[PDB]
């Protein structure tokens, strides 16, 4: 996991840049019956996708893998149906805490050079503040919806420094990043925030919430995967 067949190129979502096609193989798009993209997500293995609980995904939605340009019709993509939705029981819709949902596919995904899985961290893993990580998505680039997958590098913050911005809204199951020139925005929800650990890209955050105006001077908020991995493991082990 975490090693894309097509190596990504970073020259270092608002103020991001266009990514190399197929360089973020675990990035999927969640679409409704009409084909409307409403949230992002990440493949963790052939049968499962992880995304945000607030996205409100149902077994009537579709997972699209291997995509780059959403306006194109000549890409070799995979439209996968959803078997079951597993929302985290501790999700609080008022505080947006424990913002994580698992999707069991009704048909396994076919791995290739444009479709593969991202690695999951260990609950004890240490991702230090200041580390430069990456977030990707098809969300707004300006307050303008992009056709092509965007990417951005940004530093993780410590929850103590994030509280200076959001106060009591920052819970332990949350991690912040940004406030450095770029910003997650509408349409990015459920997408990944990845950092490289021992050579492999690892999922450390899931786009959750932030500035209503996608300010590039305010840190974005993501669900902290290390505080949620045990739940993921239990769910997988039981299904």
């Amino acid at each position: 996991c975490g090693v894309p067949a097509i190596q990504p190129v970073l020259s270092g979502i608002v103020n991001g840049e266009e990514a190399v096609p197929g360089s973020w193989p675990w990035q999927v798009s969640l679409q409704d019956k009409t084909g409307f993209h409403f949230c992002g997500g990440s493949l963790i293995n052939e049968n499962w996708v992880v995304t945000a609980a607030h996205c409100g995904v149902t077994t009537s939605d579709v997972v699209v893998a291997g995509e780059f340009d959403q306006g194109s019709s000549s890409e070799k993509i995979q439209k996968l149906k959803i078997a079951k939705v597993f929302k985290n029981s501790k999700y609080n819709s008022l505080t947006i805490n424990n913002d994580i949902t698992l999707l069991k596919l009704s048909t396994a995904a076919s791995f290739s050079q444009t479709v593969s899985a991202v690695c999951l961290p260990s609950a004890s893993d240490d991702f230090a503040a200041g580390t430069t990580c990456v977030t990707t998505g098809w969300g707004l680039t300006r307050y303008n919806t992009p056709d092509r997958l965007q990417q951005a590098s940004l530093p993780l913050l410590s929850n103590t420094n994030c509280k200076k911005y959001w106060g009591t809204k920052i819970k332990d199951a949350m991690i912040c990043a940004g406030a450095s020139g770029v910003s997650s925005c509408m349409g990015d929800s459920g997408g990944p925030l990845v950092c490289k650990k021992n050579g492999a890209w690892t999922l450390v955050g899931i786009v959750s919430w932030g500035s209503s105006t996608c300010s590039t001077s305010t840190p974005g908020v993501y669900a902290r995967v290390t505080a949620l991995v045990n739940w993921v493991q239990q769910t997988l082990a039981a299904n």
């Binding site: 993209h37 409403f38 947006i96 919806t145 509408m186 349409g187 929800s189």
Partner: protein
């Protein structure tokens, strides 16, 4: 933007919590059909 401080209102398809100054707010980042 202008909203009731601390109040949890709902934008299009996203939900938000008005800033402690009624001048801003924090919202989820979903894409809405409208």
């Amino acid at each position: 933007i202008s909203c009731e401080p601390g109040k949890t209102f709902k934008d299009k398809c996203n939900t938000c919590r008005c800033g402690a100054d009624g001048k801003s707010a924090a919202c989820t980042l979903k894409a809405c059909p409208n």
